[PDB]
Amino acid sequence: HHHHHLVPRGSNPPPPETSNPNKPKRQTNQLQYLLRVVLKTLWKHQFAWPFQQPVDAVKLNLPDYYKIIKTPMDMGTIKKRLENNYYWNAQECIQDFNTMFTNCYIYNKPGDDIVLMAEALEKLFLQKINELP
Ligand SMILES: CCN1C(=O)c2cccc3c(NS(=O)(=O)c4ccccc4)ccc1c23
């Protein structure tokens, strides 16, 4: 038989939502600090670029990524969410950050460049987090 299964093709899931009209939302002073200060200084770090958008498993040759990561999260998502006032409180935002890092530590091994980048960003996340309103 001449059906060799070269289609159908792989793909990336839909990225996380950055808007939801029926979700409860607020601006709080903690959440403004998260956008204005915390997110805007991890974002500038030179180890932040792999985290600035969702994992494109196809362009990046990580075809197991989404077999392994079932709750993906990334700083580009977190940034749009904040820009859209998507969170009800700071806990929800922070919990998105923990997820992004946790995912990184789950998919990869200690010593990997990407783990070094995440740890650097985490260490720093935590510092900026301590000085919250
Ligand atoms: C941060 C999310 N992420 C990974 O967990 C991961 C593992 C392996 C490669 C890459 C990756 N590929 S990359 O070419 O941009 C890159 C590879 C190694 C080190 C730094 C980036 C981007 C984002 C992630 C990974």
UniProtKB/Swiss-Prot annotation:
There is a cross-link at residue 67 (Glycyl lysine isopeptide (Lys-Gly) (interchain with G-Cter in SUMO2)). Ubiquitously expressed. The record marks 108 as: Acetylated histone binding. Changing residue 108 to A: Abolishes binding to acetylated histones. Phosphorylation by CK2 disrupt the intramolecular binding between the bromo domain 2 and the NPS region and promotes binding between the NPS and the BID regions, leading to activate the protein and promote binding to acetylated histones. In absence of phosphorylation, BRD4 does not localize to p53/TP53 target gene promoters, phosphorylation promoting recruitment to p53/TP53 target promoters. Signal peptide: none annotated. Changing residue 113 to G: Found in a patient with a neurodevelopmental syndrome; uncertain significance. Residues 26-132 form the Bromo domain. It is found in: Nucleus; Chromosome. It is linked to Cornelia de Lange syndrome 6: A form of Cornelia de Lange syndrome, a clinically heterogeneous developmental disorder associated with malformations affecting multiple systems. It is characterized by facial dysmorphisms, abnormal hands and feet, growth delay, cognitive retardation, hirsutism, gastroesophageal dysfunction and cardiac, ophthalmologic and genitourinary anomalies. CDLS6 inheritance is autosomal dominant. JQ1, a thieno-triazolo-1,4-diazepine derivative, and I-BET, a benzodiazepine derivative, have been tested on tumors with success. Treatment with GSK1210151A (I-BET151, a I-BET derivative) has strong effets on mixed lineage leukemia and promotes myeloid differentiation and leukemia stem-cell depletion. Interacts with p53/TP53; the interaction is direct. Interacts (via CTD region) with CDK9 and CCNT1, acting as an associated component of P-TEFb complex. Interacts with RELA (when acetylated at 'Lys-310'). Interacts (via NET domain) with NSD3, CHD4, BICRA and ATAD5. The interaction with BICRA bridges BRD4 to the GBAF complex. Interacts (via NET domain) with JMJD6 (via JmjC and N-terminal domains); the interaction is stronger in presence of ssRNA and recruits JMJD6 on distal enhancers. Interacts with NSD3. Interacts with NIPBL. Chromatin reader protein that recognizes and binds acetylated histones and plays a key role in transmission of epigenetic memory across cell divisions and transcription regulation. Remains associated with acetylated chromatin throughout the entire cell cycle and provides epigenetic memory for postmitotic G1 gene transcription by preserving acetylated chromatin status and maintaining high-order chromatin structure. During interphase, plays a key role in regulating the transcription of signal-inducible genes by associating with the P-TEFb complex and recruiting it to promoters. Belongs to the BET family. The NET domain mediates interaction with a number of chromatin proteins involved in transcription regulation (NSD3, JMJD6, CHD4, GLTSCR1 and ATAD5). This is Bromodomain-containing protein 4. The gene is BRD4. The chain holds residues 44 to 165 of 1362 of the full protein.
